[PDB]
Write a protein that binds this DNA or RNA. Structure first.
Ligand SMILES: [Mg+2]
Ligand SMILES: [Mg+2]
Ligand SMILES: [Mg+2]
Ligand SMILES: [Mg+2]
Ligand SMILES: [Mg+2]
Ligand SMILES: [Mg+2]
Ligand SMILES: [Mg+2]
Ligand SMILES: [Mg+2]
Ligand SMILES: [Mg+2]
Ligand SMILES: [Mg+2]
Ligand SMILES: [Mg+2]
Ligand SMILES: [Mg+2]
Ligand SMILES: [Mg+2]
Ligand SMILES: [Mg+2]
Ligand SMILES: [Mg+2]
Ligand SMILES: [Mg+2]
Ligand SMILES: [Mg+2]
Ligand SMILES: [Mg+2]
Ligand SMILES: [Mg+2]
Ligand SMILES: [Mg+2]
Ligand SMILES: [Mg+2]
Ligand SMILES: [Mg+2]
Ligand SMILES: [Mg+2]
Ligand SMILES: [Mg+2]
Ligand SMILES: [Mg+2]
Ligand SMILES: [Mg+2]
Ligand SMILES: [Mg+2]
Ligand SMILES: [Mg+2]
Ligand SMILES: [Mg+2]
Ligand SMILES: [Mg+2]
Ligand SMILES: [Mg+2]
Ligand SMILES: [Mg+2]
Ligand SMILES: [Mg+2]
Ligand SMILES: [Mg+2]
Ligand SMILES: [Mg+2]
Ligand SMILES: [Mg+2]
Ligand SMILES: [Mg+2]
Ligand SMILES: [Mg+2]
Ligand SMILES: [Mg+2]
Ligand SMILES: [Mg+2]
Ligand SMILES: [Mg+2]
Ligand SMILES: [Zn+2]
Lengths: 138, 99, 150, 124, 208
RNA sequence: AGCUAGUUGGUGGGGUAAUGGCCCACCAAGGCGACGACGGGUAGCCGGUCUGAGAGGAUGGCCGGCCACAGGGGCACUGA
RNA sequence: GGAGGAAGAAGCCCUUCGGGGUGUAAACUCCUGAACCCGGGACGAAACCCCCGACGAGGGGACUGACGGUACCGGGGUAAUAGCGCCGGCCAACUCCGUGCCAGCAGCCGCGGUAAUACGGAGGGCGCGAGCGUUACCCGGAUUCACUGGGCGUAAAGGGCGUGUAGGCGGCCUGGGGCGUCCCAUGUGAAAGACCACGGCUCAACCGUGGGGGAGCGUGGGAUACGCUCAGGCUAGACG
RNA sequence: CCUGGUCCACCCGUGACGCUGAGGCGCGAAAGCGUGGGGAGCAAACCGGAUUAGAUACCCGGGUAGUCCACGCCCUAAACGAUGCGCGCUAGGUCUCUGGGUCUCCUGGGGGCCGAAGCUAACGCGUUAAGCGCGCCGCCUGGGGAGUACGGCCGCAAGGC
RNA sequence: CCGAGGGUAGGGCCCGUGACUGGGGCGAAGUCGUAACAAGGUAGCUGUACCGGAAGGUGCGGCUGGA
C-alpha cells in the first residue's frame, strides 16, 4: 500500500537504470512532479511527461545514462549512480540552513522540501532556508 | 508568560476540579523521530462549568491545592470523547499486565 | 617503469600424500605519482618470482587517479565484499593517513592529503581491491557535468 | 532494529568485569602470607612456580605470584600485592610487589630492576 | 637535557650526514667520511628493509636529533603547528627554526647548534636590548639578536665571528657582521629551509 | 507491577513574609501507574573536565554557582 | 658543559684469528662558567588621615611591606649529578656465555627438552631523560549496543501458527489553521576554562586584555512545500 | 448434513474504511497426565534365544502401558524454507495445478526447476529474492557454565515459560 | 495534642554462615567401555517416554543438517 510513495519513486528510478531503460512510470503526484522537476533541471533525467494507464495518471520519466564503453561489460556509466532517501516516514529528518549537507563535495545534490518550495542544497543555502531533507542524489 | 497548555478532560469526578490530559510532541534526543508523550494536570474549576471530554486551555495558575497548580483557561471544543476512550482503554489495558 | 612498492608476501600451502607443498603470494602497487596507480597479485613457486609477477599484472591493470591540489576530488565509500574503505579528502598539508595497504597504494597514487578508514574485513588483499575500485570510481567537476549535458 | 524499536528498547551499554578485585580499586593492596607453596603450570608448560596465599587487609584471600629467581617469604610475611594474573597458573591473579615489606629484592640481579625491586649497585 | 654524549654516531645511524660539530664534520673525518654505517657491533651487516614504522620513526628522529632537542619539546612544537592554522609540515619547521638557540646558530655566532645553546644560556647572546638565556626562546619577526658588550671581547665568539665575515646567510635573515648583531626578518618558507628530512613522514609518525 | 488514609479534591478554620493537605475538623471518593507508578541499588547537581573524526562514552577533585550537612536525632528561641 | 683530538690508548666484547666494536668517546689542548664568594636591592603602596577649598568636586603633603636582603641588577668564580625502560613478532634495537620444560619470562600468539636474537649475565643497540617503568581506573582503537554506523537461510540471531489491544506507520486533489518544520529580530545563555588575536613576567607553564562564537529556552514577526489537525472531493489500496 | 478459508469473471456498491502489532485471547505434531470406554496389529518397559570379552543393545521368539475413542489437561519440537508480515519496483526459459477469454493464443492465482540484473564470506538466492526500497513486530552481541540457579507465573504431575 | 526515641509483638528484603548434599570448571600421561565424526560399522539429530555402570538403548512422531 506504499508507505512513502517517494522512496518508492526514488527506487523505481534507481531500479530502472540498473538495467538501463527508456523510461519508467512512477504513479503521479504534484510532489513527485516537483521532485522530478529537479532531477531534470539538474541533468539527472531527460525529463518527464504526464501519461495514463487506464485512467490512472502516472509520470513517464526518461532516464539519462553515459556513453557506451570499451572492454568487457561495455555498459554505460550512470547519470544517476546513487540515490537514497533521507528524512524517512519512520523518522523524519529536518535541518536548519546551517545544518544543510554538502553532498559528494559539490558533485551532488540534496533535494529537500521547505516552506518556500522544493529547493536544493545550493538553492536552499542561497535562498537561506532549511526543511525536510528529502533525499540525496548523484 | 504564565505558561499555557491545551488538552482533554479525562476525569470530572472531583469537587470543583478536572483532570486535563496533555499531549506533547518532540524530536528524540538521539534517534530523531518525533515522539509523543503526555502528562495529566489537575485543573481548578470553581464553577464545575467544565464537563467530560472538553478540549481546553490551561494556565500556569497560583497554587490552589497540593498537586493542583493550573486553572482552566477557556474552552476549545466540547465533545471529544474519542480521546477519552484512548485514555480509558490504555488504562484498562493495565489489568492484563499484572499477575 | 614506475614506483613499485610491495604490499605483502605470504606462504600458502596445500596437502598431498607425503607432505605439504608451498607457494608464495604478492600484492604489489605501482606508481609514477602523477595519478597513475596499479595493483597486482602474484603467486609463484618462489618468493622472487611472485613479486616479479606482481609488478607485471600491476603494470597491466592501472587507473587514472584524478588528483587535485595533491589530494582527491570527492569522498567515497567502497565495499569489496566484506572489506569497506573510506576515502575523504584533506586540506593541503595533512598527510596520508591510512593502513599499510590503503596508504602504500595512495602514496604512489600521488596523494598526500586524504583521511581514510578500513571497515569490515581488514583483509589486506580485499582492502587492496577496495582501495582501487574506490579510486576508479572517482569523478571531477569536469567528467561529472560531462555526463549532465543534454 | 527499526527506529521506533530503538526509541522503545534503546541500546544496551556494555559494562565490564573488573579482572581484579584488589578492592576499592586500589593500585595495590597490603596483605600477609598465609601459605607459601609452589604450584605447577598448565597446558604445554612445566615448572614449579613460587606462589603465596595472601590474607588481604580486606578480609579476602588470594593466591599471588612470586616474581624473579629465589625469594624469602614465610607463613607470616607482610607483603604488597600488585595484581596481574599469570596465564599459566589457574588461580593466580595478583603479583607480589617485590621489595616492599618482608618481600626481599632479587639477590644478584643487574638487568631490569624496577621490576624485581633490586636496588642499583656499585661498580667500585 | 640536550642529548650530551657521542654525536658523530647519529651522524652515523641516521645515515644522512649531519653537522652536530660545525668544523670537524667538515674534515675528511666526520667518522662519517670514514664509516658511512650505523654504530654498534653490527653496523657492517646486511641491512633488513625498514618497517613502514622504522622509516617514519627515523625521519622524525633525524629531524629531532638535528636541533638537539627533547622529544617532549619537539612534540609540544609539532602539536602547536597542528593547532596553528596552515600546512603543519612547514610551520613545525618555522617554529623549529624560530628557536633562539637556533637563530643564533643560523646567524653564524656559533659553530655547532650545541655550542650555540651554551652561548645563549650563558647570556653571551642577547636580543632587542635585554639578554636572554632561553634556548627555547621563540624569536619573532623583526628582532635584534645582538651579542653582549661583555661578549664581544671573547676568543671564541671572535673566531666563530671570524670566517663569518662576508659569508652569505639565509634569506629570512640579515647580518651586520661589523656590529656582530644579526636580525630575524621573516618566518622562512619551506624551500628557504634545506635539510635531509621529509617533513611529511614526521607529520605521519605522529598520526600513529 | 501494581501504589496510595492526609491518601486526591472541596467547604471552613489554623498557620506564615506568602501560596498550598503545610496543619486541623467536616464533606466527597478520589489521586498515581508499562510514557514504568511502588520498591530496591548507586549518586550531591551544574559551569566544566578527560577521551573521541565527530556523534558519543566517562567524569564532577581544584576554581565558580546552587543544594545538603556540623558526633547521631529532635526542637524551638532571639532575629531583617 | 662547548670547540679541537688517532685510520683510532688501554680495558672489555665479538672474531672466518686478517680483523670488527664501544668511538671522538676517553685521554689530552684550549674558552664558557650551574654553583657557590662580595657589594647594590624593588614593583606589590596609595588610599584612609592632615592644610587650603566646603569635611564635597578639585590641589598638596605625610605614614605603611609579611614574603625579604628574596627576586632582580653588577663583579668576581670552580667543569660541575644520570637514570629507567626495552631489543622473538605486534614494535626500533643482536651477538656471545650460562642454563637445559630446570631456573624462569609472560598483554596477547608463545619461549625454555644442550648449539635460545623470547630465561639469566655480558658487550652492543633502540627509546625517553630528572625521570623511566609498573599497578589501578576513564575514553580510544571497539563499525564489539551500530543515531552518525551492524546485523539474523547454514556463523549469535525470525516469535511453532493465527487473531487482535495499545502504540508505530498512512493513497490522489482542493482549501482553512499553522502544532511540528523553516527564516528574521530581541531577551537569555554570569564569570573561570576552551578557541582566535594582543600583549605581562628573560621564554614557557602560568597570567591580564580584547574579540568571536554556544546549542538550548522565553518573546515578536513571517513562510506553508513536507508532517499534523479540521473541512470538501476522488477511486489506483482495502472491503462489499 | 453443518462450516472455514480461497481464486476467477462482470466494474455494480462503499470511499482509504489501510499496514503492522508489545501485552491479551485462540490454535498448536508426538510423547505424556486425569476419568471412562476400547484393544486386533504394532510396541518403550519387561522375559527369554542368539551374538559378544561382556551385550542392561543392534537380529529372533514373547509382551504391559501406549497406540483408538469421549471429555479435560499438558504447550514442546530439526513446530524447518532452520528464511516474520504487508506493499511497490527490477530478463526470460521451461512443466504443473486450477480459474476466465471473438481459445495454435492471451491473461489471473498457486506449486517446482534453470537462470538477467543484483545480493552473497562462500554455498547459494534470484517476480515464491537471500535483489532494489518503505512500514511495523520479533530476535542476536565470543565458547563452556546453561535454558542451569534463584525468584516469578503456569501445570495434577512430568515439566513449561 | 503531637513529639526524638525506648519497649512489646508480627511481617518483608538483603548479606554472611552451616553437618551434609547436587551438579559445574580446571587439572602434561588413572579405570571401564565406543556413543558421535567415513553406511562410524545399527544413518544422525530430535521433542517426549521408559530403561541401563557409563557413554547410551528402545518406543512414538518429526527434520535431512543422511541415504
Ligand atoms: Mg556486506
Ligand atoms: Mg613449554
Ligand atoms: Mg625481562
Ligand atoms: Mg499531606
Ligand atoms: Mg552518597
Ligand atoms: Mg570512534
Ligand atoms: Mg545535628
Ligand atoms: Mg625489529
Ligand atoms: Mg636476554
Ligand atoms: Mg586515536
Ligand atoms: Mg586507530
Ligand atoms: Mg562505540
Ligand atoms: Mg542504524
Ligand atoms: Mg555483526
Ligand atoms: Mg544458528
Ligand atoms: Mg517460522
Ligand atoms: Mg491500530
Ligand atoms: Mg509554528
Ligand atoms: Mg563564559
Ligand atoms: Mg461516490
Ligand atoms: Mg494482523
Ligand atoms: Mg499438543
Ligand atoms: Mg497424543
Ligand atoms: Mg489415557
Ligand atoms: Mg522384539
Ligand atoms: Mg509381537
Ligand atoms: Mg521441512
Ligand atoms: Mg527458532
Ligand atoms: Mg510477526
Ligand atoms: Mg507461477
Ligand atoms: Mg535457482
Ligand atoms: Mg519466473
Ligand atoms: Mg547453552
Ligand atoms: Mg527445556
Ligand atoms: Mg523456579
Ligand atoms: Mg517507633
Ligand atoms: Mg548412535
Ligand atoms: Mg562408534
Ligand atoms: Mg552407528
Ligand atoms: Mg529418542
Ligand atoms: Mg532397552
Ligand atoms: Zn659529524
Amino acid at each position: 500500500m506504499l508507505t512513502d510513495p517517494i522512496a518508492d519513486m526514488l527506487t523505481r528510478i534507481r531500479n530502472a537504470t540498473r538495467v538501463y531503460k527508456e523510461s519508467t512510470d512512477v504513479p503521479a503526484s504534484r510532489f513527485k512532479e516537483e521532485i522530478l522537476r529537479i532531477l531534470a533541471r539538474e541533468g539527472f533525467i531527460k525529463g518527464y511527461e504526464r501519461v495514463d494507464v487506464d485512467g490512472k495518471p502516472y509520470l513517464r520519466v526518461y532516464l539519462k545514462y553515459g556513453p557506451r564503453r570499451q572492454g568487457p561489460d561495455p555498459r554505460p556509466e550512470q547519470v544517476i549512480h546513487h540515490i537514497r532517501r533521507i528524512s524517512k516516514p519512520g523518522r523524519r529528518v529536518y535541518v536548519g540552513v546551517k545544518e544543510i549537507p554538502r553532498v559528494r563535495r559539490g558533485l551532488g545534490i540534496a533535494i529537500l522540501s521547505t516552506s518556500k518550495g522544493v529547493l536544493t542544497d545550493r538553492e536552499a543555502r542561497k535562498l537561506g532556508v532549511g526543511g525536510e531533507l528529502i533525499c540525496e542524489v548523484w | 508568560p504564565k505558561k499555557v497548555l491545551t488538552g482533554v478532560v479525562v476525569s470530572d469526578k472531583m469537587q470543583k476540579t478536572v483532570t486535563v490530559l496533555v499531549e506533547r510532541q518532540f524530536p528524540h534526543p538521539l534517534y530523531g523521530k518525533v515522539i509523543k508523550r503526555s502528562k495529566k494536570y489537575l485543573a481548578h474549576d470553581p464553577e464545575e462549568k467544565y464537563k467530560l471530554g472538553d478540549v481546553v486551555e490551561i494556565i500556569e495558575s497560583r497554587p490552589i491545592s497540593k498537586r493542583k497548580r493550573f486553572r482552566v483557561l477557556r474552552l476549545v471544543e466540547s465533545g471529544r470523547m474519542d480521546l477519552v476512550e484512548k485514555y480509558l482503554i490504555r488504562r484498562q489495558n493495565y489489568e492484563s499486565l499484572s499477575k | 617503469d614506475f614506483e613499485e612498492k610491495m604490499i605483502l608476501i605470504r606462504r600458502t600451502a596445500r596437502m598431498q600424500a607425503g607432505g605439504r607443498r608451498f607457494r608464495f603470494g604478492a600484492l604489489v602497487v605501482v606508481g609514477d605519482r602523477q595519478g597513475r596507480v596499479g595493483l597486482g597479485f602474484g603467486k609463484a613457486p618462489e618468493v622472487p618470482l611472485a613479486v616479479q609477477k606482481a609488478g607485471y599484472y600491476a603494470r597491466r591493470n592501472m587507473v587514472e587517479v584524478p588528483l587535485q591540489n595533491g589530494t582527491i576530488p570527492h569522498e567515497i565509500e567502497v565495499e569489496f565484499g566484506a572489506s569497506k574503505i573510506v576515502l575523504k579528502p584533506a586540506a593541503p598539508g595533512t598527510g596520508v593517513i591510512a593502513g599499510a595497504v590503503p596508504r602504500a597504494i595512495l602514496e604512489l597514487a600521488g596523494v598526500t592529503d586524504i583521511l581514510t578508514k578500513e571497515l569490515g574485513s581488514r583483509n589486506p588483499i580485499n582492502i587492496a581491491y577496495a582501495t582501487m575500485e574506490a579510486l576508479r570510481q572517482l569523478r571531477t567537476k569536469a567528467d561529472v557535468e560531462r555526463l549532465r549535458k543534454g | 532494529p527499526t527506529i521506533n524499536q530503538l526509541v522503545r528498547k534503546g541500546r544496551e551499554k556494555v559494562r565490564k568485569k573488573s579482572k581484579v578485585p584488589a578492592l576499592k580499586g586500589a593500585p595495590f593492596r597490603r596483605g600477609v602470607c598465609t601459605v607459601v607453596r609452589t604450584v605447577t603450570p598448565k597446558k604445554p608448560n612445566s615448572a614449579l612456580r613460587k606462589v603465596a596465599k595472601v590474607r588481604l587487609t580486606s578480609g579476602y584471600e588470594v593466591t599471588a605470584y612470586i616474581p624473579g629467581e629465589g625469594h624469602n617469604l614465610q607463613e607470616h610475611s607482610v607483603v604488597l600485592i600488585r595484581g596481574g594474573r599469570v596465564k599459566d597458573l589457574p588461580g593466580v591473579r595478583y603479583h607480589i610487589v617485590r621489595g616492599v615489606y618482608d618481600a626481599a629484592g632479587v639477590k644478584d640481579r643487574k638487568k631490569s630492576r624496577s621490576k624485581y625491586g633490586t636496588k642499583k649497585p656499585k661498580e667500585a | 637535557g640536550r642529548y650530551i654524549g657521542p654525536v658523530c654516531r647519529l651522524c652515523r645511524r641516521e645515515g644522512v650526514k649531519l653537522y652536530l660539530k660545525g668544523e670537524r664534520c667538515y674534515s675528511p673525518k666526520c667518522a662519517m667520511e670514514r664509516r658511512p654505517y650505523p654504530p654498534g657491533q653490527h653496523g657492517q651487516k646486511r641491512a633488513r628493509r625498514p618497517s613502514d614504522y622504522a622509516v617514519r620513526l627515523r625521519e622524525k628522529q633525524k629531524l629531532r636529533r638535528i636541533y638537539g632537542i627533547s622529544e617532549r619539546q619537539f612534540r609540544n612544537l609539532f602539536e602547536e603547528a597542528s593547532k596553528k592554522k596552515g600546512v603543519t609540515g612547514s610551520v613545525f619547521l618555522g617554529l623549529l627554526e624560530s628557536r633562539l638557540d637556533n637563530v643564533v646558530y643560523r646567524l653564524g655566532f656559533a659553530v655547532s647548534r650545541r655550542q650555540a645553546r651554551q652561548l645563549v644560556r650563558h647570556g653571551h647572546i642577547t636580543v632587542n636590548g635585554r639578554r636572554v638565556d632561553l634556548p627555547s626562546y621563540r624569536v619573532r619577526p623583526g628582532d635584534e639578536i645582538a651579542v653582549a658588550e661583555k661578549s664581544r671581547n671573547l676568543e671564541l665568539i671572535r673566531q666563530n665571528l671570524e670566517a663569518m665575515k662576508g659569508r652569505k646567510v639565509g634569506p629570512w635573515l640579515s647580518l651586520d657582521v661589523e656590529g656582530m648583531k644579526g636580525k630575524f626578518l621573516r618566518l622562512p618558507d619551506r624551500e628557504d629551509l634545506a635539510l635531509p628530512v621529509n617533513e611529511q613522514l614526521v607529520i605521519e609518525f605522529y598520526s600513529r
